[PDB]
Design a protein around this motif. Sequence first.
Motif, PDB file in Angstrom:
ATOM      1  N   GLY A   1      31.056  43.458  45.781  1.00 28.71           N
ATOM      2  CA  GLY A   1      32.418  43.940  45.981  1.00 28.71           C
ATOM      3  C   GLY A   1      33.330  42.811  46.421  1.00 28.71           C
ATOM      4  O   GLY A   1      34.555  42.917  46.292  1.00 28.71           O
ATOM      5  N   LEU A   2      32.712  41.708  46.937  1.00 30.85           N
ATOM      6  CA  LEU A   2      33.359  40.504  47.457  1.00 30.85           C
ATOM      7  C   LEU A   2      34.206  39.795  46.423  1.00 30.85           C
ATOM      8  O   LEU A   2      33.731  39.560  45.303  1.00 30.85           O
ATOM      9  CB  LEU A   2      32.330  39.491  48.025  1.00 30.85           C
ATOM     10  CG  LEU A   2      32.031  39.494  49.525  1.00 30.85           C
ATOM     11  CD1 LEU A   2      31.278  38.250  49.904  1.00 30.85           C
ATOM     12  CD2 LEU A   2      33.295  39.570  50.363  1.00 30.85           C
ATOM     13  N   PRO A   3      35.432  39.370  46.814  1.00 30.30           N
ATOM     14  CA  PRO A   3      36.279  38.601  45.888  1.00 30.30           C
ATOM     15  C   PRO A   3      35.704  37.220  45.527  1.00 30.30           C
ATOM     16  O   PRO A   3      34.742  36.743  46.148  1.00 30.30           O
ATOM     17  CB  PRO A   3      37.598  38.481  46.641  1.00 30.30           C
ATOM     18  CG  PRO A   3      37.544  39.512  47.732  1.00 30.30           C
ATOM     19  CD  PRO A   3      36.116  39.574  48.108  1.00 30.30           C
ATOM     20  N   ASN A   4      36.289  36.600  44.490  1.00 25.64           N
ATOM     21  CA  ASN A   4      35.876  35.316  43.916  1.00 25.64           C
ATOM     22  C   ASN A   4      36.752  34.135  44.365  1.00 25.64           C
ATOM     23  O   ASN A   4      37.744  34.329  45.077  1.00 25.64           O
ATOM     24  CB  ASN A   4      35.910  35.428  42.385  1.00 25.64           C
ATOM     25  CG  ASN A   4      37.265  35.842  41.860  1.00 25.64           C
ATOM     26  OD1 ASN A   4      38.209  35.050  41.816  1.00 25.64           O
ATOM     27  ND2 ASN A   4      37.415  37.116  41.538  1.00 25.64           N
ATOM     28  N   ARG A   5      36.400  32.917  43.885  1.00 27.56           N
ATOM     29  CA  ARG A   5      37.113  31.660  44.122  1.00 27.56           C
ATOM     30  C   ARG A   5      38.639  31.816  43.934  1.00 27.56           C
ATOM     31  O   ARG A   5      39.376  31.518  44.868  1.00 27.56           O
ATOM     32  CB  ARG A   5      36.534  30.524  43.240  1.00 27.56           C
ATOM     33  CG  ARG A   5      37.291  29.196  43.334  1.00 27.56           C
ATOM     34  CD  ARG A   5      36.645  28.077  42.539  1.00 27.56           C
ATOM     35  NE  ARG A   5      37.260  27.897  41.223  1.00 27.56           N
ATOM     36  CZ  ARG A   5      36.648  28.134  40.068  1.00 27.56           C
ATOM     37  NH1 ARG A   5      35.385  28.549  40.049  1.00 27.56           N
ATOM     38  NH2 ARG A   5      37.284  27.935  38.920  1.00 27.56           N
ATOM     39  N   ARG A   6      39.092  32.333  42.759  1.00 22.83           N
ATOM     40  CA  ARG A   6      40.505  32.516  42.379  1.00 22.83           C
ATOM     41  C   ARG A   6      41.333  33.363  43.338  1.00 22.83           C
ATOM     42  O   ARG A   6      42.495  33.039  43.591  1.00 22.83           O
ATOM     43  CB  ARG A   6      40.630  33.046  40.943  1.00 22.83           C
ATOM     44  CG  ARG A   6      41.753  32.397  40.129  1.00 22.83           C
ATOM     45  CD  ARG A   6      42.060  33.171  38.855  1.00 22.83           C
ATOM     46  NE  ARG A   6      40.914  33.222  37.943  1.00 22.83           N
ATOM     47  CZ  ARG A   6      40.901  33.864  36.777  1.00 22.83           C
ATOM     48  NH1 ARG A   6      41.980  34.518  36.358  1.00 22.83           N
ATOM     49  NH2 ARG A   6      39.809  33.857  36.022  1.00 22.83           N
ATOM     50  N   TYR A   7      40.743  34.450  43.862  1.00 21.16           N
ATOM     51  CA  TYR A   7      41.370  35.349  44.831  1.00 21.16           C
ATOM     52  C   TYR A   7      41.470  34.610  46.169  1.00 21.16           C
ATOM     53  O   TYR A   7      42.545  34.590  46.776  1.00 21.16           O
ATOM     54  CB  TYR A   7      40.513  36.621  44.973  1.00 21.16           C
ATOM     55  CG  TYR A   7      40.862  37.535  46.130  1.00 21.16           C
ATOM     56  CD1 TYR A   7      40.457  37.235  47.431  1.00 21.16           C
ATOM     57  CD2 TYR A   7      41.488  38.757  45.911  1.00 21.16           C
ATOM     58  CE1 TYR A   7      40.711  38.106  48.491  1.00 21.16           C
ATOM     59  CE2 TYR A   7      41.754  39.634  46.964  1.00 21.16           C
ATOM     60  CZ  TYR A   7      41.349  39.313  48.252  1.00 21.16           C
ATOM     61  OH  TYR A   7      41.634  40.157  49.301  1.00 21.16           O
ATOM     62  N   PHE A   8      40.342  34.011  46.625  1.00 23.57           N
ATOM     63  CA  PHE A   8      40.252  33.238  47.867  1.00 23.57           C
ATOM     64  C   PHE A   8      41.361  32.193  47.955  1.00 23.57           C
ATOM     65  O   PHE A   8      42.034  32.101  48.980  1.00 23.57           O
ATOM     66  CB  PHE A   8      38.860  32.581  48.049  1.00 23.57           C
ATOM     67  CG  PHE A   8      38.650  32.007  49.433  1.00 23.57           C
ATOM     68  CD1 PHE A   8      38.489  32.843  50.535  1.00 23.57           C
ATOM     69  CD2 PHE A   8      38.638  30.631  49.641  1.00 23.57           C
ATOM     70  CE1 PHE A   8      38.313  32.310  51.821  1.00 23.57           C
ATOM     71  CE2 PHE A   8      38.499  30.100  50.934  1.00 23.57           C
ATOM     72  CZ  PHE A   8      38.340  30.940  52.014  1.00 23.57           C
ATOM     73  N   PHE A   9      41.587  31.463  46.859  1.00 20.39           N
ATOM     74  CA  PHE A   9      42.607  30.436  46.752  1.00 20.39           C
ATOM     75  C   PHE A   9      44.014  30.962  46.907  1.00 20.39           C
ATOM     76  O   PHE A   9      44.758  30.411  47.717  1.00 20.39           O
ATOM     77  CB  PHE A   9      42.402  29.595  45.501  1.00 20.39           C
ATOM     78  CG  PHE A   9      41.440  28.455  45.728  1.00 20.39           C
ATOM     79  CD1 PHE A   9      40.072  28.684  45.825  1.00 20.39           C
ATOM     80  CD2 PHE A   9      41.900  27.155  45.863  1.00 20.39           C
ATOM     81  CE1 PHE A   9      39.184  27.631  46.055  1.00 20.39           C
ATOM     82  CE2 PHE A   9      41.009  26.099  46.074  1.00 20.39           C
ATOM     83  CZ  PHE A   9      39.658  26.344  46.170  1.00 20.39           C
ATOM     84  N   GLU A  10      44.352  32.080  46.239  1.00 20.92           N
ATOM     85  CA  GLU A  10      45.676  32.688  46.389  1.00 20.92           C
ATOM     86  C   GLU A  10      45.948  33.181  47.794  1.00 20.92           C
ATOM     87  O   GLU A  10      46.909  32.709  48.403  1.00 20.92           O
ATOM     88  CB  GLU A  10      45.992  33.738  45.310  1.00 20.92           C
ATOM     89  CG  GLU A  10      46.793  33.160  44.147  1.00 20.92           C
ATOM     90  CD  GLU A  10      48.021  32.352  44.534  1.00 20.92           C
ATOM     91  OE1 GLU A  10      49.084  32.965  44.793  1.00 20.92           O
ATOM     92  OE2 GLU A  10      47.912  31.105  44.608  1.00 20.92           O
ATOM     93  N   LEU A  11      45.058  34.041  48.350  1.00 19.85           N
ATOM     94  CA  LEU A  11      45.157  34.509  49.737  1.00 19.85           C
ATOM     95  C   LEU A  11      45.132  33.333  50.706  1.00 19.85           C
ATOM     96  O   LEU A  11      45.986  33.263  51.585  1.00 19.85           O
ATOM     97  CB  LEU A  11      43.997  35.450  50.064  1.00 19.85           C
ATOM     98  CG  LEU A  11      44.334  36.913  50.085  1.00 19.85           C
ATOM     99  CD1 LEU A  11      44.161  37.519  48.714  1.00 19.85           C
ATOM    100  CD2 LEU A  11      43.435  37.629  51.022  1.00 19.85           C
TER     101      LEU A  11
END
Lengths: 153, 154, 154, 153, 154, 154
Positions: B3-13
């Motif tokens: 369910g955990l987000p990925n690299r791309r989401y982590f970078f934006e947030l």
Amino acid sequence: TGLPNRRYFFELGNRYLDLAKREGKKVFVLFVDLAGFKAINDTYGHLSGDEVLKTVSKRILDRVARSDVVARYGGDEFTILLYDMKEEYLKSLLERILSTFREPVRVENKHLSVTPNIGVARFPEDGENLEELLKVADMRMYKAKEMKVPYFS
Amino acid sequence: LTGLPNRRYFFELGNRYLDLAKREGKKVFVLFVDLAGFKAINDTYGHLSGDEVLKTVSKRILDRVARSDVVARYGGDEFTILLYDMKEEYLKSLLERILSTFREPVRVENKHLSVTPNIGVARFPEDGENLEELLKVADMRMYKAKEMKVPYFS
Amino acid sequence: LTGLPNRRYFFELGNRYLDLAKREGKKVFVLFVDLAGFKAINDTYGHLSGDEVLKTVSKRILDRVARSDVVARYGGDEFTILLYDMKEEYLKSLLERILSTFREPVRVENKHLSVTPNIGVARFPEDGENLEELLKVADMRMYKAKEMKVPYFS
Amino acid sequence: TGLPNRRYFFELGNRYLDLAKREGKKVFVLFVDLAGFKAINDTYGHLSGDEVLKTVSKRILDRVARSDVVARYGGDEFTILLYDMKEEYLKSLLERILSTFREPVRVENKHLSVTPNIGVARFPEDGENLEELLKVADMRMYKAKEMKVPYFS
Amino acid sequence: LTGLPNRRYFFELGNRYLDLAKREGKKVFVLFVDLAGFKAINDTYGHLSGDEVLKTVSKRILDRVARSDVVARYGGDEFTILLYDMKEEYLKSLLERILSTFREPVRVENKHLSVTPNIGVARFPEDGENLEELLKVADMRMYKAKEMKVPYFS
Amino acid sequence: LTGLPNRRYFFELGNRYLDLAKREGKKVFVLFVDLAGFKAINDTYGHLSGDEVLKTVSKRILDRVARSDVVARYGGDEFTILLYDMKEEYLKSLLERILSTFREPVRVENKHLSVTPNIGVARFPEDGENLEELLKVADMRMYKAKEMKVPYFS
């Protein structure tokens, strides 16, 4: 569990206190109560409650130092004795023990939950024998229990 | 799944969190979590077993961080955690509780699989002005911890 | 290509911003921007023309918000803006500068296309504890503004 | 439809333009608008409007060369890219495409009508990138649309 | 049925058109349209199916010619088109638009039936002085196109 | 984020390039680039380090190819390059300039990471009529180069 009992804890305990008296060191006495355990045996039986006790023991044993005394007091209760350890070591040990019990115990096809409540006493400040220190630690775990907090030192 | 987000989401947030910290005059901790023993898990037990371990690892991190903390999977043995305006005491405790959780070998099926945690910490602004810089410092520090056979490097 | 994030991204960042505000004891403004005249633009000039207007509208919003402000497209005539811990003065000014930008009919090709802005505002915590709640209050308030023939309602 | 989208069209499109720049060739960009489509969905629904889009796509695809790029822009819109083709090939292609849409589309027990409006742009004359050429082609299809003529080049 | 006139009508109108062209000093194009695949359609699906295809084929030709153009059915897979005083450009375009319609397999019932068009062109006066002569030149040229596997021959 | 397209984009553009070459009577070179040392990089330094190397490798290829050349990441140690209508001289030079870039160990953090390049070349039409065929010939030829301990095989 393989873990020693009340009688063993008391003999080793007082020797540790005798040694601390002579060397001019402190001793921490932890009283660990695992709430949710009286509900586990009264629902799933002794084998399930015993398998949880075996996991709980191994979890405490793996997190304490070689010179730390771990024993099971009775029912939901375990006692830990720390000879001459820094307050930093204690805060970290409490955090690592609490962290383990956030993980519901897997016994069979069941996922059983226990909540930890720990009380701390310090020798010499809180008492001169193991019986006194355990009562202070037990009073402090009960303060923690009723306050819905994990630990009280 | 995790369910955990990925690299791309982590970078934006992540960068938004840094933009916010810049304006509010706050610090941000970036944790780089590497779980050694994982490459050996898939090469021996397969993807399902390796994935079931990833699902447990994720839930274990998620249960220990605060609601406002950003947890994501970087890739392979790697997870990233972002702490906005938290005390150093909160971090030392969080690291201890996360390390404690991986001392427990993971139960997947009839197996008891072991992973060893290695964490590197970076602080915004001191260690860098963007997420890419901070992750590199944190990654360098977890690699220092990995080679030194210690659990974490701050 | 506006480059602007979608509803799904807005919601993830949005709720994190609210989690952060809850902990820090700060307010969050949620703006619901509706651009009237857009339903007619595509039905008359087509998708490319309507899309080129969306690209200009996006760039216009993006250029006027702070680096830490979250801008996203909701859907159709709709855009959402999130302001973390900003003064009411900053909001009144931001609304004026955004409205001023749309007084300018958009130049797409040899065409001069007009859109009218309608903005609704919601405040966290007063108006709700999650993003869906705040967006509905903001949407209700932009619709009050829309029917009242006024530019904004806070 | 199986037909690619705006994002794919743009990547292939610009590569085609990069290639034309180097080889000293022209590129035609067609902007196809199918009037009557907004009315089809607002009356018969998405499935009917989608079945018409599937027929429209297959009709364009069957009439272009293997090296021609066909994509759906959005709504009533399709884009066609012709690399290094003679003006004769273009006039013929436009005639064959317009001829197909004279045939009302059969969806279920319905006979649905769409009217084609095509605008043409030429690289390099009309622009140096796909965004510029599409706007010129879109302006020219809109001139054709308002003039009630089929195509404008 | 198709409403389309026959050989006898085509011949009367045809020659009048030629008489008129002779006097006015104009050209006339005579198209001979053969639809291959038609002998196989009736031998497999029957007369009704073959007739429904003929009705669609007729309507398709009729919709693409000018009001003053004469369309008629010759015989089997055959149709004739007469163009009075039209530019060669008009003819090239008309041939393309007719060929384009037959690329579309005909839908009759739950069947998708295919016909392939073959067109031959003759020009008055160059190719002959009467309709019988022009049709034979056009028929020869459609047969050249048929055997050459090309769509049209002028 | 390399920005570089994937296998599925490469295939669509690739085949279009081949369709275009077929019609124009031109050749197309397909390069299969393998970077040995990469499987050891991620297994020692982790994904972030391996990814930072991939970002540098991509930028290095991108800076050396022409605007009309198609560069994409195949998977793992692999990258593909497509050259439409280029002289053999251009290819020999491009291969030399790409090989020259990997002689310099990549700097990620405080690490100096080494990758060794292996390139295989295929020519359209000689080696095949589609991208799948050409890539297999190029892949076979890079593997011949790899085992022969030489940089490239054409």
